[PDB]
């Protein structure tokens, strides 16, 4: 009935059960042939894959799951024992994501947190027994990138070397966030170009490594 339900049904019929790569490809194929810009582009996948491989994070926080594409992508590269937590404000999307993870066989690696990031982040330490995050992937509402970065520092969830990787920092754009992490001695930033096909525009991802309180 909905976009998200069709995508799921498409994966379940066409992708190989247990194989995350086939799941990611069933989705890429579907958005190619069926949908307009749901952020179609291979540079983004390349960048995400390399950041995970480069820093091998033991605990990853993802903000905004949608149908579970980025969750499947990231979690498939996680070492045994490592974990992904993904926050999703929308219960229907959270339900799809769970299904998408069960099919990919990644459900034991990932935990879906139902709610708004601004409410859940202050509960990570005491309710979800989190000490510090190794990596944060910001991909939810653009006006929450900066607030949720500040909230993560404030709740003591970042440590020296925690990787922040932020998608869509150019289109539609999160310029306050960028000016902040670039301007702060507490982050060292790198920018990665990210071409999006249907809008034929160069978007970008920002990698910001926490340097400790400053
Ligand atoms: N404050 C908030 N807390 C949690 N989730 C949010 C949020 N604001 C938006 N979202 C969710 O974040 C998602 C952005 S789309 C994310 C796409 C996903 N990263 C992927 O690559 O497939 C939407 O599903 C939206 O429901
Ligand atoms: K900086």
Coordinates of C-alpha atoms and ligand atoms in Angstrom, one line a residue:
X1 CA 0.0 0.0 0.0
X2 CA 2.7 2.5 1.0
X3 CA 6.1 3.0 -0.5
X4 CA 7.8 1.4 2.4
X5 CA 5.6 -1.7 2.2
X6 CA 6.3 -2.2 -1.5
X7 CA 10.1 -1.9 -1.0
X8 CA 9.9 -4.6 1.7
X9 CA 7.7 -6.9 -0.4
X10 CA 10.1 -6.4 -3.3
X11 CA 13.1 -7.4 -1.2
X12 CA 11.4 -10.4 0.3
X13 CA 10.6 -11.8 -3.2
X14 CA 13.8 -10.9 -5.0
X15 CA 16.7 -10.6 -2.6
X16 CA 18.5 -13.7 -1.3
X17 CA 17.5 -14.5 2.3
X18 CA 20.4 -14.1 4.7
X19 CA 22.5 -12.1 2.4
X20 CA 22.7 -8.3 3.3
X21 CA 24.3 -7.4 0.0
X22 CA 21.4 -8.9 -2.0
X23 CA 19.1 -7.0 0.2
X24 CA 20.9 -3.7 -0.5
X25 CA 20.8 -4.5 -4.2
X26 CA 17.1 -5.4 -4.3
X27 CA 16.5 -1.9 -2.8
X28 CA 18.9 -0.1 -5.1
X29 CA 17.2 -1.8 -8.1
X30 CA 13.7 -0.9 -6.8
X31 CA 14.4 2.8 -6.2
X32 CA 16.0 2.9 -9.6
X33 CA 13.1 1.5 -11.6
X34 CA 10.1 2.6 -9.4
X35 CA 10.9 5.8 -7.5
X36 CA 12.1 9.4 -8.0
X37 CA 14.8 10.8 -5.7
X38 CA 14.9 8.8 -2.5
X39 CA 18.6 9.9 -2.4
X40 CA 20.0 7.6 -5.2
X41 CA 23.8 7.5 -5.3
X42 CA 26.7 5.1 -5.1
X43 CA 29.2 7.5 -3.6
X44 CA 27.3 7.6 -0.3
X45 CA 27.4 3.8 0.0
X46 CA 31.2 3.9 -0.8
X47 CA 31.9 6.5 1.9
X48 CA 29.8 4.7 4.6
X49 CA 31.5 1.4 3.8
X50 CA 34.9 2.9 4.1
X51 CA 34.2 4.8 7.3
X52 CA 33.0 1.6 9.0
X53 CA 36.0 -0.4 7.7
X54 CA 38.4 2.3 8.7
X55 CA 37.3 2.8 12.3
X56 CA 35.8 -0.6 13.1
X57 CA 33.3 0.8 15.7
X58 CA 32.2 -1.5 18.5
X59 CA 28.9 0.5 19.1
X60 CA 27.2 2.6 16.4
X61 CA 24.3 5.0 16.9
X62 CA 22.1 5.7 13.8
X63 CA 19.6 8.6 13.9
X64 CA 16.7 7.9 11.5
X65 CA 16.2 4.4 10.1
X66 CA 13.5 4.7 7.5
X67 CA 13.3 1.3 5.9
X68 CA 16.6 0.1 7.2
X69 CA 18.9 0.6 4.2
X70 CA 21.7 2.3 6.0
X71 CA 21.2 0.0 9.0
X72 CA 21.7 -3.1 6.9
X73 CA 24.6 -1.4 5.1
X74 CA 26.5 -0.5 8.3
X75 CA 25.6 -3.6 10.4
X76 CA 26.9 -6.0 7.7
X77 CA 30.4 -4.6 8.1
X78 CA 30.4 -4.8 11.9
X79 CA 32.7 -7.2 13.6
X80 CA 31.4 -10.0 15.8
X81 CA 30.4 -8.5 19.1
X82 CA 29.8 -5.1 17.7
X83 CA 26.3 -3.4 17.8
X84 CA 24.1 -0.9 16.1
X85 CA 21.4 1.1 17.8
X86 CA 19.1 3.0 15.4
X87 CA 16.5 5.5 16.5
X88 CA 13.3 5.9 14.5
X89 CA 10.5 8.3 15.4
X90 CA 8.0 6.6 13.1
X91 CA 6.5 3.2 14.2
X92 CA 5.6 2.1 10.7
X93 CA 9.1 2.7 9.5
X94 CA 10.5 1.0 12.6
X95 CA 8.3 -2.1 11.8
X96 CA 9.6 -2.2 8.2
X97 CA 13.2 -1.9 9.4
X98 CA 12.9 -4.8 11.7
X99 CA 11.5 -7.0 8.9
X100 CA 14.3 -5.8 6.6
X101 CA 16.8 -6.8 9.3
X102 CA 15.3 -10.2 9.9
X103 CA 15.5 -11.0 6.2
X104 CA 19.1 -9.8 6.1
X105 CA 19.8 -12.0 9.1
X106 CA 21.2 -9.0 11.0
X107 CA 18.6 -8.7 13.8
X108 CA 21.0 -10.0 16.4
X109 CA 23.5 -7.1 15.6
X110 CA 21.0 -4.3 15.6
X111 CA 18.5 -2.8 18.1
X112 CA 15.7 -0.5 17.0
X113 CA 14.8 2.3 19.4
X114 CA 11.3 3.6 19.0
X115 CA 11.0 7.3 19.6
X116 CA 12.4 10.8 18.9
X117 CA 16.2 11.1 19.1
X118 CA 15.8 14.2 21.4
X119 CA 13.9 12.1 24.0
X120 CA 16.0 8.8 23.6
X121 CA 19.5 10.2 23.7
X122 CA 19.3 11.4 27.3
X123 CA 18.1 7.8 28.2
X124 CA 21.0 5.9 26.5
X125 CA 23.3 5.9 29.6
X126 CA 20.9 4.9 32.3
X127 CA 18.3 2.9 30.4
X128 CA 20.3 1.3 27.7
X129 CA 23.5 1.0 29.7
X130 CA 25.7 2.9 27.2
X131 CA 29.0 4.3 28.3
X132 CA 30.3 6.0 25.1
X133 CA 29.5 5.8 21.4
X134 CA 32.2 4.8 18.8
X135 CA 30.3 6.2 15.9
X136 CA 27.2 8.2 15.2
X137 CA 25.5 8.4 11.8
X138 CA 23.2 11.4 11.5
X139 CA 20.5 11.0 8.9
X140 CA 17.2 12.1 10.4
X141 CA 15.6 15.6 10.5
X142 CA 18.0 18.2 9.2
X143 CA 17.2 20.8 11.9
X144 CA 18.2 18.2 14.6
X145 CA 21.8 17.6 13.4
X146 CA 23.3 20.4 15.5
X147 CA 21.0 20.1 18.5
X148 CA 21.5 16.3 18.7
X149 CA 25.3 16.8 18.4
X150 CA 25.2 19.2 21.4
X151 CA 22.9 16.9 23.3
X152 CA 25.3 14.0 22.7
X153 CA 28.2 15.9 24.1
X154 CA 26.1 17.1 27.0
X155 CA 25.1 13.6 28.0
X156 CA 28.7 12.4 27.9
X157 CA 28.2 10.0 25.1
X158 CA 31.1 11.1 23.0
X159 CA 34.8 10.2 23.6
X160 CA 38.1 11.2 21.9
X161 CA 37.9 9.5 18.5
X162 CA 34.1 9.0 18.3
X163 CA 33.2 9.4 14.6
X164 CA 30.3 11.5 13.6
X165 CA 29.3 10.9 10.0
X166 CA 26.5 13.2 8.8
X167 CA 24.5 12.6 5.5
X168 CA 22.8 15.3 3.4
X169 CA 24.9 18.2 4.7
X170 CA 24.5 20.1 1.5
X171 CA 21.1 19.1 0.1
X172 CA 18.7 20.3 1.5
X173 CA 21.6 21.2 3.8
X174 CA 22.6 21.5 7.4
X175 CA 24.8 24.6 7.4
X176 CA 24.5 25.5 11.1
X177 CA 25.8 22.0 12.0
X178 CA 28.7 22.3 9.6
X179 CA 29.7 25.8 10.8
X180 CA 29.7 24.4 14.3
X181 CA 31.7 21.2 13.9
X182 CA 34.2 22.9 11.6
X183 CA 34.5 25.9 13.9
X184 CA 34.9 23.8 17.1
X185 CA 38.3 22.7 18.4
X186 CA 36.4 19.6 19.6
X187 CA 35.9 18.2 16.1
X188 CA 38.2 17.5 13.2
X189 CA 36.2 17.4 10.0
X190 CA 36.5 16.0 6.6
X191 CA 34.0 16.6 3.8
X192 CA 33.1 13.9 1.2
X193 CA 31.3 14.8 -2.1
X194 CA 28.2 12.8 -2.7
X195 CA 26.5 13.0 -6.1
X196 CA 22.7 12.4 -6.2
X197 CA 21.4 11.2 -9.6
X198 CA 17.7 12.2 -9.8
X199 CA 18.4 15.8 -8.7
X200 CA 21.8 15.7 -10.5
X201 CA 23.3 17.6 -7.6
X202 CA 26.5 17.2 -5.6
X203 CA 25.4 16.7 -2.0
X204 CA 28.0 15.7 0.7
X205 CA 28.8 13.8 3.9
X206 CA 30.7 15.3 6.8
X207 CA 32.9 13.2 9.0
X208 CA 33.6 14.9 12.3
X209 CA 35.9 13.2 14.9
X210 CA 35.4 14.2 18.5
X211 CA 38.6 15.5 20.1
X212 CA 37.3 15.7 23.6
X213 CA 35.8 18.6 25.6
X214 CA 37.1 22.1 24.6
Ligands
LIG1 N1 13.9 13.4 15.8 C1 13.9 12.2 15.2 N2 14.1 11.1 15.8 C2 14.1 9.9 15.3 N3 13.9 9.7 14.0 C3 13.6 10.8 13.2 C4 13.6 12.1 13.7 N4 13.2 12.9 12.7 C5 13.1 12.2 11.6 N5 13.3 10.9 11.9 C6 13.3 9.7 10.9 O1 14.5 9.7 10.2 C7 14.3 9.2 8.9 C8 15.0 10.0 7.9 S1 15.2 9.1 6.4 C9 16.6 8.1 6.9 C10 17.1 7.2 5.8 C11 18.0 6.1 6.3 N6 19.2 6.7 6.9 C12 18.5 5.3 5.1 O2 19.7 5.6 4.6 O3 17.8 4.5 4.6 C13 12.8 9.1 8.7 O4 12.4 7.8 8.7 C14 12.2 9.9 9.9 O5 11.0 9.2 10.3
LIG2 K1 36.5 21.8 13.8

